[PDB]
């Protein structure tokens, strides 16, 4: 019975977790010799 | 900024025509400002899809409520698929913009 009562609100927690994970993934989109050569060429 | 661009276009020697390099750089910079709307639209669409999926699972599948394990598995699979597809969609949008 206690678990059934808990399940009444678990979907909301799952949705919140999914939204947070999606936001975190979205934030991840944008945040030596080759680099030196590129810098020299740019200069 | 306009005065600086004009001075660069004029150059050391006398000249009046504006080199196309400055115009190309300015237009590219202006166009680059259009990236954020695309990301915002993608995020809004993803959130709307997640809300639709949650509503369908909770309401449109009342029978599925009798098997919470299956519901959890379906939700996890859908979330994994969306996470996998998100970078592909972002790369496609970036390629389309760069084209």
Swiss-Prot record, chain B:
Sequence segments annotated as region (Middle domain): 1-99
PTM comment text: Phosphorylation/dephosphorylation events on two sites near the GED domain regulate mitochondrial fission. Dephosphorylated on this site by PPP3CA which promotes mitochondrial fission. Dephosphorylated by PGAM5. Sumoylated on various lysine residues within the B domain, probably by MUL1. Sumoylation positively regulates mitochondrial fission. Desumoylated by SENP5 during G2/M transition of mitosis. Appears to be linked to its catalytic activity.
Subcellular location: Cytoplasm, Cytosol; Golgi apparatus; Endomembrane system; Mitochondrion outer membrane
Taxonomic superkingdom: Eukaryota
Tissues/organs with expression: Ubiquitously expressed with highest levels found in skeletal muscles, heart, kidney and brain. Isoform 1 is brain-specific. Isoform 2 and isoform 3 are predominantly expressed in testis and skeletal muscles respectively. Isoform 4 is weakly expressed in brain, heart and kidney. Isoform 5 is dominantly expressed in liver, heart and kidney. Isoform 6 is expressed in neurons.
Mutagenesis / variant outcome for changing residue 13 to C: In EMPF1; the mutation acts in a dominant-negative manner; reduced oligomerization; decreased mitochondrial recruitment; defects observed in mitochondrial fission
Coiled coil ranges: none
TM spans (from-to): none
Subunit structure: Homotetramer; dimerizes through the N-terminal GTP-middle region of one molecule binding to the GED domain of another DNM1L molecule. Oligomerizes in a GTP-dependent manner to form membrane-associated tubules with a spiral pattern. Interacts with GSK3B and MARCHF5. Interacts (via the GTPase and B domains) with UBE2I; the interaction promotes sumoylation of DNM1L, mainly in its B domain. Interacts with PPP3CA; the interaction dephosphorylates DNM1L and regulates its transition to mitochondria.
Protein family: Belongs to the TRAFAC class dynamin-like GTPase superfamily. Dynamin/Fzo/YdjA family.
Pathological condition linked to this protein in its record: May be associated with Alzheimer disease through amyloid-beta-induced increased S-nitrosylation of DNM1L, which triggers, directly or indirectly, excessive mitochondrial fission, synaptic loss and neuronal damage.
Function noted in UniProt: Functions in mitochondrial and peroxisomal division. Mediates membrane fission through oligomerization into membrane-associated tubular structures that wrap around the scission site to constrict and sever the mitochondrial membrane through a GTP hydrolysis-dependent mechanism. The specific recruitment at scission sites is mediated by membrane receptors like MFF, MIEF1 and MIEF2 for mitochondrial membranes.
Swiss-Prot/TrEMBL domain comment: The GED domain folds back to interact, in cis, with the GTP-binding domain and middle domain, and interacts, in trans, with the GED domains of other DNM1L molecules, and is thus critical for activating GTPase activity and for DNM1L dimerization.
Protein name: Dynamin-1-like protein
Organism: Homo sapiens (Human)
Lineage of producing organism: Eukaryota, Metazoa, Chordata, Craniata, Vertebrata
Gene designation: DNM1L
Full-length numbering of the shown residues: 391 to 489 of 736
């Amino acid at each position: 019975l206690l678990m059934h009562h808990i399940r009444d609100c678990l979907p909301e927690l799952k949705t919140r977790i999914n939204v947070l994970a999606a936001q975190y993934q979205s934030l991840l989109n944008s945040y030596k010799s080759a680099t030196l050569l590129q810098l020299i060429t740019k200069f | 900024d306009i005065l600086t661009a004009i001075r660069n276009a004029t150059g050391p020697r006398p000249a009046l025509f504006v080199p196309e390099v400055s115009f190309e750089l300015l237009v590219k910079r202006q166009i680059k400002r259009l990236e954020e709307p695309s990301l915002r639209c993608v995020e809004l669409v993803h959130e709307e899809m997640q809300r639709i999926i949650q509503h369908c699972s909770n309401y449109s599948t009342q029978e599925l409520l009798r098997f919470p394990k299956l519901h959890d598995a379906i939700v996890e699979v859908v979330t994994c698929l969306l996470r996998k597809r998100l970078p592909v969609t972002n790369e496609m949008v970036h390629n389309l913009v760069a084209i």
